[PDB]
Design a protein around this ligand. Structure first.
Ligand SMILES: [Co+2]
Ligand SMILES: [Co+2]
Lengths: 246, 246
């Protein structure tokens, strides 16, 4: 494949005073475009975007029984109110109920987790810092480019997991459905960090538009929760401008 | 396997002077609610709702290679401009590209087609009169209740087909995606026939709302295409009133 830097998208970033990068790749031509080649290769905490490989591994190892698996709430308090209730896989993925996936990771275990991340070529594959924390506040790091490569393998069912489990996770990732296109995506947010070293916000996934497929990965520095919506609005505006969605 | 009449839905029909039926079943098809007990089991030509079993059979027999199958347009005139282009499986289903599925049917062949419709307990299983038009103008008939049972089996991956192939068709059927739910569905429209012998319009599928699932099937007599949008608005209004979608 190839990648080229462009500038026609910069306006979307400057208008919101955002420091970030968008990587958009066209499947048929194996061609990618980005506003920042440097940042496209910089690696950041996956945060909730890790729910994608975590879900696949959970299914492949049997921790997650099947597509109809219901994650029953133990009634015990949770960081969020929307996390306090029974959830399906898609439900757990969207409200991004950390507790549910922390449990999954713990059951998967360090040896197996390490094994699949190697097979998935997932970022720096560093899971040190707590089996249930590495993707949240640990050592794991991944770039936007690596995100799209990973998502393409998932789309093509080429990851080291059953076709069935990859299919299950892909449908759970459906976020927008239109007659002409289907959007599979996942958000991520590590936190606000500081102004010196801000946290990171993500939005990655792919668009099946007509006979074409567009893989995308977006990330930005964030030191204030009020800016969260930008993780989706900026790349959405870009893809709308490209005539892919909207 | 009970069917219970519900009078709180009739208003949606009478308000539009529509003769039809809506069948809704929470959790499973063994207990369903409907506005018309008799019509709920009355069988009608499936029209394009037949694309669901046709797609599954196409995949099972290998006629449809896999999930990424592209159905190429030969450049010859098709009934709708929206059909004159290459299409993916979901693309063909969403725009209801009849010629794509007619070719799938021809390749499947009468022997295999008959075998699978028997396996799926699909309506009266009558495919006579022409392998590429039995669901369009032939003698094949299926009721709203049968549609729900068929869709339920698909949801549970209980049809006589690989889990992989059922998953492929289920994603291609996604028509609405919201944070709290996903709607899998397919429309149908036989034509307008006459006033004395009206055609039929369908909207069948299921809603995955939170940890619950609702299977539904709607059909109505129709002799004027201007009334077609009602196949969706009436059942949508009923499910919105039930607090399922919207
Ligand atoms: Co897809
Ligand atoms: Co589903």
């Amino acid at each position: 494949g190839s990648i080229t830097e462009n500038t026609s998208w910069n306006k979307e970033f400057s208008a919101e005073a955002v420091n970030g990068v968008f990587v958009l790749c066209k499947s048929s031509s194996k061609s990618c475009a980005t506003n920042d080649l440097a940042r496209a290769s910089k690696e950041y905490l996956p945060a909730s975007t890790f729910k994608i490989p975590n879900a696949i591994i959970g299914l492949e190892t049997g921790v997650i029984k099947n597509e109809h698996q219901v994650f029953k709430w133990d009634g015990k308090p949770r960081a969020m109110k929307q996390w306090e209730r029974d959830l399906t896989l898609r439900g757990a993925i969207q409200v991004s109920a950390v507790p549910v996936f922390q449990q999954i990771a713990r059951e998967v275990g360090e040896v197996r987790m390490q094994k699949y991340l190697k097979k998935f070529s997932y970022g720096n594959q560093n899971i040190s810092g707590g089996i249930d924390k590495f993707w949240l506040e640990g050592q794991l790091r991944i770039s936007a480019v690596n995100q799209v490569e990973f998502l393409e393998s998932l789309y093509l069912n080429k990851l080291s997991a059953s076709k069935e489990n990859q299919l299950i996770v892909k449908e759970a990732l459906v976020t927008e459905a239109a007659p002409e296109y289907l959007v599979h995506s996942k958000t991520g947010f590590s936190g606000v960090g500081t102004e010196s070293n801000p946290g990171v916000a993500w939005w990655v996934g792919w668009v099946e538009k007509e006979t074409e497929v567009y893989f995308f990965a977006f990330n930005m520095d964030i030191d204030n929760e009020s800016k969260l919506p930008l993780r989706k609005s900026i790349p959405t505006k870009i893809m709308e401008s490209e005539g892919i969605i909207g």
